[PDB]
């Protein structure tokens, strides 16, 4: 079993690397000054944003809005590709596969968003750019309040100091939650999570031997993930009631209508 769990961990990590182009490792190298990667253009005001458009591949709050959207959709596409590699996932009832993805993708998105963040801002455009926390906070209501909750989580979450091999199993654990609403066959989902949970436990113990109860502390973080989703959805509802001229991407619209 112990050798089997390591096999499971290595399998998931390999799938993770194959599925997510911008890893935490790449993100850290960019954010700290490493020579393996190159420096981002920093956007911190209106003119940096204007010049950033020239360097990086009508209202700005709207443009930034539309930017996250395309990125979220892309992320959903990646997380979906990853889930199919989770042993057992494709063998589940198709309705359950959908349900697991529906409630799971945003929790993974915010998890992985933490990798691209520090207390000062977030990587964008596959790491070419960097948007500051304060520029985001300064955006007009309600747009200014969207990102700050993510930062506060990311700051707390990044203190756990997980690397990608850690995250690979954790996101796998998130997808295979037996307590999602509407699931038909909970039992096969829980059997897969049991093994995934076992593998996370051993992975965290071997990769972080000195940080006690990291497993427990990491599982407790799923609480914070939920509140991020709940709060976000409510802020989105304000947008739809106010900006009747724009809409969510169909895929995003399906994920959200009607989650909770
Ligand atoms: C990756 O997490 C985010 C962050 C912001 C998001 C989204 C997702 C989505 C998509 C989603 O909810 O998955 C939309 C549609 N966002 C916005 O409109 C928005 C509003 C204000 C600002 Cl300052 C920035 C973006
Ligand atoms: C999910 O987290 C975020 C937050 C902000 C983002 C993005 C992602 C992306 C997508 C990405 O990160 O690749 C873009 C593109 N964001 C912009 O604010 C932006 C910058 C310049 C222009 Cl012209 C328009 C929008």
UniProtKB/Swiss-Prot annotation:
The keyword Coiled coil is annotated on this UniProt entry: no
Any GO BP annotation: negative regulation of SMAD protein signal transduction
GO molecular function terms noted in the UniProt entry: alpha-actinin binding; arachidonate binding; chromatin binding; DNA binding; DNA binding domain binding; DNA-binding transcription activator activity, RNA polymerase II-specific; DNA-binding transcription factor activity; DNA-binding transcription factor activity, RNA polymerase II-specific
Keywords linked to the UniProt accession: Activator, Biological rhythms, Cytoplasm, Diabetes mellitus, Disease variant, DNA-binding, Glycoprotein, Isopeptide bond, Metal-binding, Nucleus, Obesity, Phosphoprotein, Receptor, Transcription, Transcription regulation, Ubl conjugation, Zinc, Zinc-finger
Segments forming domain NR LBD: 4-258
Residues in cross-link Glycyl lysine isopeptide (Lys-Gly) (interchain with G-Cter in ubiquitin): 18
Tissue: Highest expression in adipose tissue. Lower in skeletal muscle, spleen, heart and liver. Also detectable in placenta, lung and ovary.
Location relative to the cell: Nucleus; Cytoplasm
Protein task: Nuclear receptor that binds peroxisome proliferators such as hypolipidemic drugs and fatty acids. Once activated by a ligand, the nuclear receptor binds to DNA specific PPAR response elements (PPRE) and modulates the transcription of its target genes, such as acyl-CoA oxidase. It therefore controls the peroxisomal beta-oxidation pathway of fatty acids. Key regulator of adipocyte differentiation and glucose homeostasis. ARF6 acts as a key regulator of the tissue-specific adipocyte P2 (aP2) enhancer.
Subunit-structure text: Interacts with FOXO1 (acetylated form). Heterodimer with other nuclear receptors, such as RXRA. The heterodimer with the retinoic acid receptor RXRA is called adipocyte-specific transcription factor ARF6. Interacts with NCOA6 coactivator, leading to a strong increase in transcription of target genes. Interacts with coactivator PPARBP, leading to a mild increase in transcription of target genes. Interacts with NOCA7 in a ligand-inducible manner. Interacts with NCOA1 and NCOA2 LXXLL motifs. Interacts with ASXL1, ASXL2, DNTTIP2, FAM120B, MAP2K1/MEK1, NR0B2, PDPK1, PRDM16, PRMT2 and TGFB1I1.
Record protein name field: Peroxisome proliferator-activated receptor gamma
Record organism: Homo sapiens
Complete-protein stretch covered: 235 to 505 of 505
């Amino acid at each position: 079993e112990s050798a089997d769990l390591r096999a499971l961990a290595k399998h998931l990590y390999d799938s993770y690397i194959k599925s997510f182009p911008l890893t935490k490792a790449k993100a850290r190298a960019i954010l700290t000054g490493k020579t393996t990667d190159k420096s981002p253009f920093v956007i911190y005001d209106m003119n940096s944003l204007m010049m950033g458009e020239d360097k990086i591949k009508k209202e700005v709050a709207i443009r930034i809005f539309q930017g996250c959207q395309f990125r979220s959709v892309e992320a959903v596409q990646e997380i979906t590709e990853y889930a199919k590699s989770i042993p057992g996932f494709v063998n589940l009832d198709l309705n359950d596969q959908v349900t697991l993805l529906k409630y799971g993708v945003h929790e993974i998105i915010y998890t992985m968003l933490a990798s691209l963040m520090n207390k000062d801002g977030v990587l964008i455009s596959e790491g070419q750019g960097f948007m500051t926390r304060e520029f985001l906070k300064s955006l007009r209501k309600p747009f200014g309040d969207f990102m700050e909750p993510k930062f506060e989580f990311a700051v707390k979450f990044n203190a756990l100091e997980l690397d990608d091999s850690d995250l690979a199993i954790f996101i796998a654990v998130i997808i295979l939650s037996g307590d999602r609403p509407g699931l038909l066959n909970v039992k096969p989902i829980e059997d897969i999570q049991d093994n995934l949970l076992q593998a996370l436990e051993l992975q965290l113990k071997l990769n972080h031997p000195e940080s006690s109860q990291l497993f427990a502390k990491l599982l407790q973080k799923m609480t914070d993930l939920r509140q991020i989703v709940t709060e976000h959805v409510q802020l989105l509802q304000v947008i739809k009631k106010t900006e009747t001229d724009m809409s969510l991407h169909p895929l995003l619209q399906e994920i959200y209508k009607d989650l909770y």
